[PDB]
Symmetry: C3
């Protein structure tokens, strides 16, 4: 018996909008220490990993573990409901068929109570992260977003390219070509406009722009995006939450 009460219903809506456009189904493992989730694109080139810790809820109680599969399209239809600053309460009784989402507003009158049917997904859950990534940068999520969006208009493939104190995004298509170079710097008038970079080995990797575009939708959810690149593994783009995170693992393009 689960009873997890988001402070503002807008968060859960947002974390789900954050990543709904790239994957159709999703398995939510609810535990004593919060809910965690994973979603693999059907293409198997993008994985979405989510963690919501207890400190992201106004209240939270999971007596036993529960796994809730659910169609993201359905769940987010239900999440357009209610008002934006209401208490959304996830509820499930043990070994369930239905999760129910229970919205109540700053007065006690509208008791809006939806209930979603659960899909059945098998928990081949993936641990795809690495100890050490060839490079690690970190920049404003809005910035990463303009440069992705901008370059996606030129071809299907954006090429990230990292060399000592130099992070370079590039697209190359029929129209023409595009090239956004950026460099690390601690700015102090807003220590959050900054750009961090740690390089152990230079990288040069290419990515589907389709997917980069899906990934940057997570900017609604943190001011900063951390992206970790490696030749040996999928790249990891990560948006930190209050308690928790939203990760996107993304595989590079071949030749």
């Amino acid at each position: 018996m689960l009873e997890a009460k988001f402070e503002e219903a807008s968060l859960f809506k947002r974390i789900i909008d954050g990543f709904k456009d790239c994957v159709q189904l999703v398995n939510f493992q609810c535990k004593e220490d919060g809910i965690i989730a994973q979603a693999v694109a059907a293409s198997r080139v993008l994985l979405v990993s989510l963690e919501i810790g207890v400190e992201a809820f106004q209240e939270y109680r999971c007596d036993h573990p529960v796994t809730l599969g659910m169609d993201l399209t359905s769940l987010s239809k239900i999440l357009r409901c209610g008002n934006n600053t209401d208490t959304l309460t996830l509820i499930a009784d043990n070994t369930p068929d239905s999760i129910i989402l229970l919205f109540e507003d700053t007065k006690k009158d509208r008791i809006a109570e939806y209930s979603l049917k659960l899909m059945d997904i098998d928990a081949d859950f993936l641990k795809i992260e690495e100890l050490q990534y060839d490079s690690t940068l970190s920049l404003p999520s809005s910035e990463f977003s303009k440069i992705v969006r901008d370059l996606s208009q030129l071809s299907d493939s954006i090429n990230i390219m990292i060399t000592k104190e130099t992070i370079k995004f590039v697209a190359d298509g029929d129209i023409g070509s595009g090239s956004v170079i950026i460099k690390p710097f601690v700015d102090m008038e807003h220590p959050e406009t900054s750009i961090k970079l740690e390089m152990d080995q230079p990288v040069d990797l290419t990515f589907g722009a389709k997917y980069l575009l899906d990934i940057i939708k997570g900017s609604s959810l943190s001011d900063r995006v951390g992206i970790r690149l490696s030749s040996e593994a999928p790249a990891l783009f990560q948006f930190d939450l209050k308690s928790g995170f939203l990760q996107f693992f993304l595989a590079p393009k071949f030749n």
Copy 2:
């Protein structure tokens, strides 16, 4: 010879936007005491009844009765014209072929004068309202609108259900299910957020959500919606105007 001068052109535009999306044609009976109108959906499950009394015009003069039929799509194209705070003047000469709509703005320069061709509709006009309805509730039109819109995503049919001091809206579909319960209360910090209910007999009726969705567009036009339900007749949803009203009669779904 008709010469009816709306104060703000935005009103007539709005009362027509209020109900244009559900019915294609419309017969406007213009009389000494104002204009009244009726429109039946082709499906014959929704009737739209309008009254605009003299106190909704800055000026008004109908020498003899006139009936003006007109295609709502055409009329509302003409009503996108001019500016939003202009004097819109309906004009017709007796036994006419064309209504003309005459827009003029807060300076005397733009004389914008459109003219619409009249369709020919036969006046099988309907008196479908009842003396006593099983129940009568009354709530904020914006509220009724969110709860309609919210539930319409779950199935094609929303089910209203009224029992002593309890008004309950419900939808039930494949996704899952939804249930918004609401209760009467005189609030006094804004006596207009309130919720009134008068029940003589409990009701339980189902409605096309298509149509509920068309109906709530009338919320642009009054802060409050009054809805009157009966087993023996179509339900009546009503938005009050300054002088007049916009009614929707709506028939329930069968089995």
Copy 3:
């Protein structure tokens, strides 16, 4: 070797948005005294003539003349890039294959550098303007825009009609008919709301509304539109820039 530096990148974007929707290709002649351009609709009923003088650039240097053809769809994709208040720098080396567009923002970090491939257009450039036009009016570009947009809903053809101190726009279709009359006046509380008219001969001409609609998009670019009509030639609609202009030559409809 060209190096032309718009103050705000938004201008070049805007002058191109101003007229991109009517013509697909465009030949930009760059010279010591600025850049000038011409674009003919494939229908050969609309010509677009542009002049950007040196005083529209923060810096400008054209060593030798250069002609740059370019697909407007491609160029404006590139012009959605960067931020709205950045320095956009047109660059070309002599006898080039590629123009490059170089965006930099109010801090020196994002060096965003796109490059467009040039099409090959033959410079059959047109001098289609007249010494004396039957009439010359001049009005607020936003006004000309509402009256165009408004009337276009009634038919495919708007008819301008000028007679001593009387400028009259009219549309006539199946729906009905529309008629916006306007008259000259020096207003002084804003000498820019005014309406000027000079008539040498009355005119009566008809125009594709398609095209009038494309033309009025130039209102983003000047508060005033000047339109010059003649029976013997295409009408000239003109939006003045800081240093330069955007003209539309438009041919009348036959019978």
